[PDB]
JSON list of C-alpha atoms and ligand atoms in Angstrom, two decimals:
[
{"chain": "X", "resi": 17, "resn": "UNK", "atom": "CA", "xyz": [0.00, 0.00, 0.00]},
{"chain": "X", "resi": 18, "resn": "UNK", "atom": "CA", "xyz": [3.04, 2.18, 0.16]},
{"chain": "X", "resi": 19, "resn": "UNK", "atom": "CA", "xyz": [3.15, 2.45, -3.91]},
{"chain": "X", "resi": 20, "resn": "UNK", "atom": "CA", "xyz": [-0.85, 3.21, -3.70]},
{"chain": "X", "resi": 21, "resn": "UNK", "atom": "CA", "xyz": [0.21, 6.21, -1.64]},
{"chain": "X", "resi": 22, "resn": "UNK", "atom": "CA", "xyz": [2.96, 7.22, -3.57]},
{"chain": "X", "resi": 23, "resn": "UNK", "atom": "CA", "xyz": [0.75, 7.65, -6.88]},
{"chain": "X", "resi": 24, "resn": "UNK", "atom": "CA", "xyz": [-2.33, 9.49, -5.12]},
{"chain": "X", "resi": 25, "resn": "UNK", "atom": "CA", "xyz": [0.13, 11.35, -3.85]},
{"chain": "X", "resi": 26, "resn": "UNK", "atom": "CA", "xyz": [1.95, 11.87, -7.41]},
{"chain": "X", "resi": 27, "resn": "UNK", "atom": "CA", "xyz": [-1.70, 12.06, -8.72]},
{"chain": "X", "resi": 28, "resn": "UNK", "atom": "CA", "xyz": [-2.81, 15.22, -6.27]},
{"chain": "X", "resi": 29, "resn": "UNK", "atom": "CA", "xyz": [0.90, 17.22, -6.72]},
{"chain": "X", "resi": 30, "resn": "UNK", "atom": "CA", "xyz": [-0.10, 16.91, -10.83]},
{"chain": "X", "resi": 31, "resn": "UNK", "atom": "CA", "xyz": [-3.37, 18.48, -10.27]},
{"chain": "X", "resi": 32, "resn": "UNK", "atom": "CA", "xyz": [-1.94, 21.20, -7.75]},
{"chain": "X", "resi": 33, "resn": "UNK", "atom": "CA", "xyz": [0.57, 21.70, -10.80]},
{"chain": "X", "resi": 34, "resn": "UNK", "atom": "CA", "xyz": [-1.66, 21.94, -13.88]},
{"chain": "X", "resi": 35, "resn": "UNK", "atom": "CA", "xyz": [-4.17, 23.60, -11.53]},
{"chain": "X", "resi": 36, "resn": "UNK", "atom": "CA", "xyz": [-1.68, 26.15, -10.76]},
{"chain": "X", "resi": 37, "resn": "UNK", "atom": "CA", "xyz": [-0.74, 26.80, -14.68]},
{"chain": "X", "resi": 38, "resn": "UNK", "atom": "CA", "xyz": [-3.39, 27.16, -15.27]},
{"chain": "X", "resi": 39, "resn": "UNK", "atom": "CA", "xyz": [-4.22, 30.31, -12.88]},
{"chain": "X", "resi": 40, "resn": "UNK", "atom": "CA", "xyz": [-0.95, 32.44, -13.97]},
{"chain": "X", "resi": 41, "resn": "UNK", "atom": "CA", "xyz": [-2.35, 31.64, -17.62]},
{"chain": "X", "resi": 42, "resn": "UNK", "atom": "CA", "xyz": [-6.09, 32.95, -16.55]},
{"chain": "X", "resi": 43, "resn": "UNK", "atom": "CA", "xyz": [-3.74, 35.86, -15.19]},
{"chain": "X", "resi": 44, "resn": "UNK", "atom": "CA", "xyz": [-1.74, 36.50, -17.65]},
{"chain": "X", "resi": 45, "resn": "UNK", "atom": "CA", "xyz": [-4.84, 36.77, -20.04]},
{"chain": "X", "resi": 46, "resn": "UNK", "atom": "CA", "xyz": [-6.02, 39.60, -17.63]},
{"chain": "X", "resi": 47, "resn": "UNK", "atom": "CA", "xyz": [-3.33, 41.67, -18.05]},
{"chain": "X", "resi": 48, "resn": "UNK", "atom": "CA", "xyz": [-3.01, 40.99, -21.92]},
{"chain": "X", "resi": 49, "resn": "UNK", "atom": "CA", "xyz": [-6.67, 42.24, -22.14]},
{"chain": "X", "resi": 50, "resn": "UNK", "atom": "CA", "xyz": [-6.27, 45.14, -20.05]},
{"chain": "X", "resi": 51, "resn": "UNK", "atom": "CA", "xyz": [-3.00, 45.71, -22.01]},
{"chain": "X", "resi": 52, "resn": "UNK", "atom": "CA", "xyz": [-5.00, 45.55, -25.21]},
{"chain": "X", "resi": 53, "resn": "UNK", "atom": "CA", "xyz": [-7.99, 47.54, -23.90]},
{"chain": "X", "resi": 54, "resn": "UNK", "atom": "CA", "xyz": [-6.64, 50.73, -27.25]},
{"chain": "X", "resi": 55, "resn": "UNK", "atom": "CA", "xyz": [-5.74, 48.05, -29.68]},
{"chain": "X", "resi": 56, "resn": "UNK", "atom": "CA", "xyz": [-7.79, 46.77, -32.80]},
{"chain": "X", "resi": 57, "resn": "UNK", "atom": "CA", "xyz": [-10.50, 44.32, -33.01]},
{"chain": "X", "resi": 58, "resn": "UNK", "atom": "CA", "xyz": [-8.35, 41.85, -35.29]},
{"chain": "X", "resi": 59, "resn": "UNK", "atom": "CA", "xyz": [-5.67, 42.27, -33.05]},
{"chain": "X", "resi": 60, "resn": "UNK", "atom": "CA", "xyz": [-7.99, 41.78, -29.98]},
{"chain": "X", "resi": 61, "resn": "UNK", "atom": "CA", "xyz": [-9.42, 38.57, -31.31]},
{"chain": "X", "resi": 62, "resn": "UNK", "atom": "CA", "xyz": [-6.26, 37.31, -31.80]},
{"chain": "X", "resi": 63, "resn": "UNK", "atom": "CA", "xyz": [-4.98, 37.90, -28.03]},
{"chain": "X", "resi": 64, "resn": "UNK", "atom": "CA", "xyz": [-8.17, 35.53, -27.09]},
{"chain": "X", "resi": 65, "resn": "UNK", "atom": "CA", "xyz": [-6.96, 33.03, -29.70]},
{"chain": "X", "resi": 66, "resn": "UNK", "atom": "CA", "xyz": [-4.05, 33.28, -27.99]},
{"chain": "X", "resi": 67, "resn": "UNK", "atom": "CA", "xyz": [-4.78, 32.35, -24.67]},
{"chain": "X", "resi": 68, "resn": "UNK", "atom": "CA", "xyz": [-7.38, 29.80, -25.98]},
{"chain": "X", "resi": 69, "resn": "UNK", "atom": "CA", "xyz": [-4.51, 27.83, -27.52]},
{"chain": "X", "resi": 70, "resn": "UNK", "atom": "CA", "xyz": [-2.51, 28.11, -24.41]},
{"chain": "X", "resi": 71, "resn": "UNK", "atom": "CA", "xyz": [-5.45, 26.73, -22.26]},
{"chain": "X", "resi": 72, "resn": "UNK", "atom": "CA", "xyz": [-5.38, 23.87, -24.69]},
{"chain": "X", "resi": 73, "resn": "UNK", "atom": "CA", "xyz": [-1.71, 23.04, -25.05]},
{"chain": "X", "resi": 74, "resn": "UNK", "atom": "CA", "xyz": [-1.90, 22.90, -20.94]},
{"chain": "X", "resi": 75, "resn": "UNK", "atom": "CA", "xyz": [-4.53, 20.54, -21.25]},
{"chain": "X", "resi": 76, "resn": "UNK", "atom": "CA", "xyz": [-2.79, 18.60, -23.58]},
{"chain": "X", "resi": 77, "resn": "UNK", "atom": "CA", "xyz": [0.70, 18.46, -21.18]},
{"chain": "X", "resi": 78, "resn": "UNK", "atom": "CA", "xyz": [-1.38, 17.57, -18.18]},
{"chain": "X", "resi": 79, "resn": "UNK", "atom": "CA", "xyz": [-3.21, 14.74, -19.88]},
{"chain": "X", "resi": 80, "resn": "UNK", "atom": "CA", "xyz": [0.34, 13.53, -21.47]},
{"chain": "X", "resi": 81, "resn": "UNK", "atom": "CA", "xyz": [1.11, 13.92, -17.69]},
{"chain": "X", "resi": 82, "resn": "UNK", "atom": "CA", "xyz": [-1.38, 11.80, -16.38]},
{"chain": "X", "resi": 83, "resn": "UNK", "atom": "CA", "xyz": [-1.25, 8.70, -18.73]},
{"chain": "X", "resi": 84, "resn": "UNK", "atom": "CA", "xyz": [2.69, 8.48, -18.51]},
{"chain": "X", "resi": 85, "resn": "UNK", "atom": "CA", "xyz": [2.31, 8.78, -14.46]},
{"chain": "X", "resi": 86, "resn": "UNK", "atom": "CA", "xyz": [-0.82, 6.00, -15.18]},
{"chain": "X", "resi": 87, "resn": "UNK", "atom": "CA", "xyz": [1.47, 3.55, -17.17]},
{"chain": "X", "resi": 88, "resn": "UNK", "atom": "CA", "xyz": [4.58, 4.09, -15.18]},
{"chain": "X", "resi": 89, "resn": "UNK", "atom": "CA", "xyz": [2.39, 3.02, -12.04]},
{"chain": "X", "resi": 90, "resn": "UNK", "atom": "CA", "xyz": [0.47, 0.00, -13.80]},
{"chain": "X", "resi": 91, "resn": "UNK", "atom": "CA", "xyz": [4.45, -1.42, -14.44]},
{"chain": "X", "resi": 92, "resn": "UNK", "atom": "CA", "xyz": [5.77, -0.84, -10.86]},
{"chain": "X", "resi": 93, "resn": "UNK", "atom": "CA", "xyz": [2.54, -2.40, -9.61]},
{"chain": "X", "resi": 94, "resn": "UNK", "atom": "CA", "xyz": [2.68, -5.58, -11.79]},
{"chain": "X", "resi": 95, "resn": "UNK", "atom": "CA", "xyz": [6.10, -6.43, -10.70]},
{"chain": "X", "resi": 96, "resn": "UNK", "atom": "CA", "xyz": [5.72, -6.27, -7.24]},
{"chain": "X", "resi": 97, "resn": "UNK", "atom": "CA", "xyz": [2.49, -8.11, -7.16]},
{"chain": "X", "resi": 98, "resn": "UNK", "atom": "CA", "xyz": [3.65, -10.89, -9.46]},
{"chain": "X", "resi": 99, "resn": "UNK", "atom": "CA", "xyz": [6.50, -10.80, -7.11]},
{"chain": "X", "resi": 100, "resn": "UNK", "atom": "CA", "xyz": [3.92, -11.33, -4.10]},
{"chain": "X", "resi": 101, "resn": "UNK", "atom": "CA", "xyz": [1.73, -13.95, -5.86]},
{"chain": "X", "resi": 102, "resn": "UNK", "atom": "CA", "xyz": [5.00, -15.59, -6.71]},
{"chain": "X", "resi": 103, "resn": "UNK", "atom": "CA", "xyz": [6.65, -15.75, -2.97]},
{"chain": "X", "resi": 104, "resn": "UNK", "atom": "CA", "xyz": [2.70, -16.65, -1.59]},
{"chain": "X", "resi": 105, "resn": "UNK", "atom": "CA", "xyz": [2.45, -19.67, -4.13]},
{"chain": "X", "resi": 106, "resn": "UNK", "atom": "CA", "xyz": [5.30, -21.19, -3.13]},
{"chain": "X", "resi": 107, "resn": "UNK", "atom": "CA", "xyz": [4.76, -20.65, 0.95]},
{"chain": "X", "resi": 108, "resn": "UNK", "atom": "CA", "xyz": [1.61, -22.40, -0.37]},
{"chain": "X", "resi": 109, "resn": "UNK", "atom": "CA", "xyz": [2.43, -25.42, -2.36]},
{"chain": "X", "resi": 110, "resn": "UNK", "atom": "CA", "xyz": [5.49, -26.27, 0.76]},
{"chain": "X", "resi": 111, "resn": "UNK", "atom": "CA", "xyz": [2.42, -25.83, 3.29]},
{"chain": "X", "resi": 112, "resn": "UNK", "atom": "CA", "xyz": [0.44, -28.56, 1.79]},
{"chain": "X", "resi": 113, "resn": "UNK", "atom": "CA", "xyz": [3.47, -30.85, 1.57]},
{"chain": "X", "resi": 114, "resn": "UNK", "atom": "CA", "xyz": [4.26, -30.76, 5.06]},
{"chain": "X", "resi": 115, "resn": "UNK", "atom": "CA", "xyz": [3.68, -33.90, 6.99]},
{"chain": "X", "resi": 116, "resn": "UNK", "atom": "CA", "xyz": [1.40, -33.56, 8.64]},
{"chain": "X", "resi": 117, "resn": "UNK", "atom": "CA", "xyz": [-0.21, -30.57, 7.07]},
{"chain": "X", "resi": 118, "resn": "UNK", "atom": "CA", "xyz": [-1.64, -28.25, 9.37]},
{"chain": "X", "resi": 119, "resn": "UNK", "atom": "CA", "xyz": [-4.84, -27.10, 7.88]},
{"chain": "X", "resi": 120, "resn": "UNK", "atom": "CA", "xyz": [-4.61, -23.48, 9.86]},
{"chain": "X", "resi": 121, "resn": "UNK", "atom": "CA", "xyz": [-1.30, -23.36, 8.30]},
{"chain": "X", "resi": 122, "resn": "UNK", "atom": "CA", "xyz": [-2.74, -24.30, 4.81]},
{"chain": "X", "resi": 123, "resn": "UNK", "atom": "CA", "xyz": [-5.74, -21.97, 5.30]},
{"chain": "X", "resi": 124, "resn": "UNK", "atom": "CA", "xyz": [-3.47, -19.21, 6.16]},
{"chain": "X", "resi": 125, "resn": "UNK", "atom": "CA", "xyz": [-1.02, -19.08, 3.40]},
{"chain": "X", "resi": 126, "resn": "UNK", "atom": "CA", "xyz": [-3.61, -20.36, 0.64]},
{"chain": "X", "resi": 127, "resn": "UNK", "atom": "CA", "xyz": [-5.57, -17.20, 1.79]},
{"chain": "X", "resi": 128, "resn": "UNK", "atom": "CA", "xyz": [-2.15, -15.18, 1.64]},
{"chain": "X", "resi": 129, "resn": "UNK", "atom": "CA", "xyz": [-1.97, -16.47, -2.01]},
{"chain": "X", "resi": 130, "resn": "UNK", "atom": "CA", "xyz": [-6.05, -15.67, -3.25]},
{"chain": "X", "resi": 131, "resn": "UNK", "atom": "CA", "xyz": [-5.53, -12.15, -2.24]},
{"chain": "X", "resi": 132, "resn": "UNK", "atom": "CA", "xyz": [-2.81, -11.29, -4.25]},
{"chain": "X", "resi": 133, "resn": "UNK", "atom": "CA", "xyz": [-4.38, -12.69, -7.07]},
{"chain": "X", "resi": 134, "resn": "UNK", "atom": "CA", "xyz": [-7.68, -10.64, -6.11]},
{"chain": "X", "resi": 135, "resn": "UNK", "atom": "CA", "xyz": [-5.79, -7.82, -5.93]},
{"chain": "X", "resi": 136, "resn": "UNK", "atom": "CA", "xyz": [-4.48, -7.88, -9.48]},
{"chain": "X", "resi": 137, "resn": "UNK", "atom": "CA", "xyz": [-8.04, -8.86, -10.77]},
{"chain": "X", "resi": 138, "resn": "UNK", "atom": "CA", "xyz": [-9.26, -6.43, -8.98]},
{"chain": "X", "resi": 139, "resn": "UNK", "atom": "CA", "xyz": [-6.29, -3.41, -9.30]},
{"chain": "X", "resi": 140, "resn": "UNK", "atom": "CA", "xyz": [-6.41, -3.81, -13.08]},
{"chain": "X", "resi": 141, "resn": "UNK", "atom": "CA", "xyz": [-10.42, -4.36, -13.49]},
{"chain": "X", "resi": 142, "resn": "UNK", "atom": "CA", "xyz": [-10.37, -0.78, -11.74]},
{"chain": "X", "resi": 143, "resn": "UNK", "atom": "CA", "xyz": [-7.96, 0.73, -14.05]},
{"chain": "X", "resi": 144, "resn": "UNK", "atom": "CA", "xyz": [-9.68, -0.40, -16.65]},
{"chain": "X", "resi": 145, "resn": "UNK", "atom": "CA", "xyz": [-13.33, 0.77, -15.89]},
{"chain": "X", "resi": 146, "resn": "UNK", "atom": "CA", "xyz": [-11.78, 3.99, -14.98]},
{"chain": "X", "resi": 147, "resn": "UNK", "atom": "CA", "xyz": [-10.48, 4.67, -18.61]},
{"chain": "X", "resi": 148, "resn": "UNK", "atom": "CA", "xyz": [-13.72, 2.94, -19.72]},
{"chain": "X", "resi": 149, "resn": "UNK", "atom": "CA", "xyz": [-15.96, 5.65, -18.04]},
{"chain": "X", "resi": 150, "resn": "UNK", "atom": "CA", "xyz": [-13.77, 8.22, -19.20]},
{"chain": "X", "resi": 151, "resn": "UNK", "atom": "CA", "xyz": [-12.90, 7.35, -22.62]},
{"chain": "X", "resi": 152, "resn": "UNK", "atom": "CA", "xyz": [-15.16, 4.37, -24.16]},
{"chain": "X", "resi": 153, "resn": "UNK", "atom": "CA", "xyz": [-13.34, 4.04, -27.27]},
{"chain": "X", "resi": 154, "resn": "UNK", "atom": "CA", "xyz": [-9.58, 4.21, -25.78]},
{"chain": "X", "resi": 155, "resn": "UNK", "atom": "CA", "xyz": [-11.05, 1.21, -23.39]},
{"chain": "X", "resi": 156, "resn": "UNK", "atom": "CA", "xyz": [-12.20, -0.66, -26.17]},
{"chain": "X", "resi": 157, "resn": "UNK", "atom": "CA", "xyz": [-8.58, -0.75, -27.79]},
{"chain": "X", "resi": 158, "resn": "UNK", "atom": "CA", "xyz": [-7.32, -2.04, -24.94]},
{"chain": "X", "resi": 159, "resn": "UNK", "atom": "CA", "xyz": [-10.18, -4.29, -24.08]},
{"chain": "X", "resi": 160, "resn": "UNK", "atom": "CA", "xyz": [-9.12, -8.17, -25.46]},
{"chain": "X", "resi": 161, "resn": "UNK", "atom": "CA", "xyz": [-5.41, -7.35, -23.40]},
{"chain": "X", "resi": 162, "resn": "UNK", "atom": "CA", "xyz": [-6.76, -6.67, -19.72]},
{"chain": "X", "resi": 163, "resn": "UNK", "atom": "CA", "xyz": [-9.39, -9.45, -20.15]},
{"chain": "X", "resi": 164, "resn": "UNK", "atom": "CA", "xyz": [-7.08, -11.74, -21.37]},
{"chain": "X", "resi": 165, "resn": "UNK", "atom": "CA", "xyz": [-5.33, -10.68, -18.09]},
{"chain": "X", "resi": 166, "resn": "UNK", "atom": "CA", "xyz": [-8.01, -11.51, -16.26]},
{"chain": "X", "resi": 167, "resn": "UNK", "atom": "CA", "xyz": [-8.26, -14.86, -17.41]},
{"chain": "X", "resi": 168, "resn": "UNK", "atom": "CA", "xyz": [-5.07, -15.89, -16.79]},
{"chain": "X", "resi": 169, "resn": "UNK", "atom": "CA", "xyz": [-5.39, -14.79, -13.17]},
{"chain": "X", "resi": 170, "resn": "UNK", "atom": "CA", "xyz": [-8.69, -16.60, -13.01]},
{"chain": "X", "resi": 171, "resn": "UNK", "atom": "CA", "xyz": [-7.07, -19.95, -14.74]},
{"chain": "X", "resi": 172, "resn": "UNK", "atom": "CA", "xyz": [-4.07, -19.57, -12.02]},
{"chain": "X", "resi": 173, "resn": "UNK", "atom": "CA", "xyz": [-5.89, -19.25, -9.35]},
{"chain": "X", "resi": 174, "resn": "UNK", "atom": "CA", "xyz": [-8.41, -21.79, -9.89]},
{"chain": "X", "resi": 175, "resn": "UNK", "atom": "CA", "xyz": [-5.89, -24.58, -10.61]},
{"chain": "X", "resi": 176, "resn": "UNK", "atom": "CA", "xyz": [-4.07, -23.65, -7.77]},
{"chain": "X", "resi": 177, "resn": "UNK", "atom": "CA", "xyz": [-7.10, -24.06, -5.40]},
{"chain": "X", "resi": 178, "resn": "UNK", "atom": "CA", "xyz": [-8.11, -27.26, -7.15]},
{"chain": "X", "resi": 179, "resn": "UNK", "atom": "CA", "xyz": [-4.19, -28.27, -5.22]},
{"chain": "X", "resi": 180, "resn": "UNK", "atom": "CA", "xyz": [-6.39, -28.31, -2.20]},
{"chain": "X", "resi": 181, "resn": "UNK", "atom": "CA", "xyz": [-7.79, -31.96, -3.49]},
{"chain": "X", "resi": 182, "resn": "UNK", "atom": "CA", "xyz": [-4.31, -33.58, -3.21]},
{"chain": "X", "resi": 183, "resn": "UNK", "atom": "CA", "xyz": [-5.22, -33.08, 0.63]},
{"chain": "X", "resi": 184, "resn": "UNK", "atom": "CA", "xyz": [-8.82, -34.61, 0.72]},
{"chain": "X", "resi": 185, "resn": "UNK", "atom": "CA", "xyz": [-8.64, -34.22, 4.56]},
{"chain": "X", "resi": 186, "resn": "UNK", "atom": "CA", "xyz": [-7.41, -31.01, 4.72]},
{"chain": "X", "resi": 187, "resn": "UNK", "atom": "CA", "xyz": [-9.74, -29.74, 2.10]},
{"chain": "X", "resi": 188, "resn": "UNK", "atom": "CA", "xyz": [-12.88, -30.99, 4.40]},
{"chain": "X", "resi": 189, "resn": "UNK", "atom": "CA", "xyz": [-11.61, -29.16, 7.62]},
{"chain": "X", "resi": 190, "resn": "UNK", "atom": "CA", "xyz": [-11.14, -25.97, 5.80]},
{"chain": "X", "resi": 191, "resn": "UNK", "atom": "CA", "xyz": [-13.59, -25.64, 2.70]},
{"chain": "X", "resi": 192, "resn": "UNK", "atom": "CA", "xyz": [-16.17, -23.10, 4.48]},
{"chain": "X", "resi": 193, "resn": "UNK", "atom": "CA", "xyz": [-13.49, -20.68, 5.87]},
{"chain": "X", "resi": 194, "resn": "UNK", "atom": "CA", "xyz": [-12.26, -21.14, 1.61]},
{"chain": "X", "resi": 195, "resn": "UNK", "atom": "CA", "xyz": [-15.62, -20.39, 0.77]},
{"chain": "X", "resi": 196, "resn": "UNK", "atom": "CA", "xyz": [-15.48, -17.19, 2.75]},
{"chain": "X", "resi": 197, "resn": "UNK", "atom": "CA", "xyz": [-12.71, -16.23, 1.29]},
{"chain": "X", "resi": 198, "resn": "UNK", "atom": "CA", "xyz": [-14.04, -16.89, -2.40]},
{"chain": "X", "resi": 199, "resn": "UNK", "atom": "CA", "xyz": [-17.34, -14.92, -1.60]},
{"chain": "N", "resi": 201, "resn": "ZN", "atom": "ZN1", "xyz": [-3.37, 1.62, -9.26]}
]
């Protein structure tokens, strides 16, 4: 949750930024107008063309702004959470070897494991529907590579609960608490 913080963080300083721009621009407009208060018509609709196509090349920086601080965030993200699933798995599978197995053991570190795959599902779902809401036809380019994403978490996670069933007994004193978890 500490890189979660660092981009709403990044995300606020980017708004306080642009935001900012944005006000000396509004300012600097004022005193153009005022300065222009004696000149010509075609030279005063050119000083709001002006500032019109500064407004909009701001725009354009901040939104370049946001989708490179976006994309740089989606990569760190990835990594360490693959790096989690990874590191969970494997506590995981060498809990359900252990002899005996110790089904609060096996609960605890399978449970370790399903919610670092729901938080991928669930991280990249939201990043998703956010462009989505915002921009329906960017989300639709990117549509068949974030659900194929999906399904591969799904497909992983599935065939590593289906593990469980190598365990029979250990599967029957723990299935409700997995249900739980699941729902
Ligand atoms: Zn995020």
């Amino acid at each position: 949750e500490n890189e979660h913080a660092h981009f709403q963080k990044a995300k606020e300083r980017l708004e306080a930024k642009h935001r900012e721009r944005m006000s000396q621009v509004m300012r600097e407009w004022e005193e153009a107008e005022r300065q222009a208060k004696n000149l010509p018509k075609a030279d005063k609709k050119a000083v709001i063309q002006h500032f019109q196509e500064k407004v909009e090349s701001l725009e354009q920086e901040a939104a370049n702004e946001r989708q490179q601080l976006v994309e740089t965030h989606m990569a760190r993200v990835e990594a360490m959470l693959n790096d989690r699933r990874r590191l969970a798995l494997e506590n995981y599978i060498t809990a359900l070897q252990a002899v005996p197995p110790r089904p609060r053991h096996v609960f605890n570190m399978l449970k370790k494991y399903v919610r670092a795959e729901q938080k991928d599902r669930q991280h990249t779902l939201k990043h998703f529907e956010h462009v989505r809401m915002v921009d329906p036809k960017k989300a639709a380019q990117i549509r068949s590579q974030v659900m194929t994403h999906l399904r591969v978490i799904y497909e992983r996670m599935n065939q590593s609960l289906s593990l469980l069933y190598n365990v029979p007994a250990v599967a029957e004193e723990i299935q409700d608490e997995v249900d739980e978890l699941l729902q």
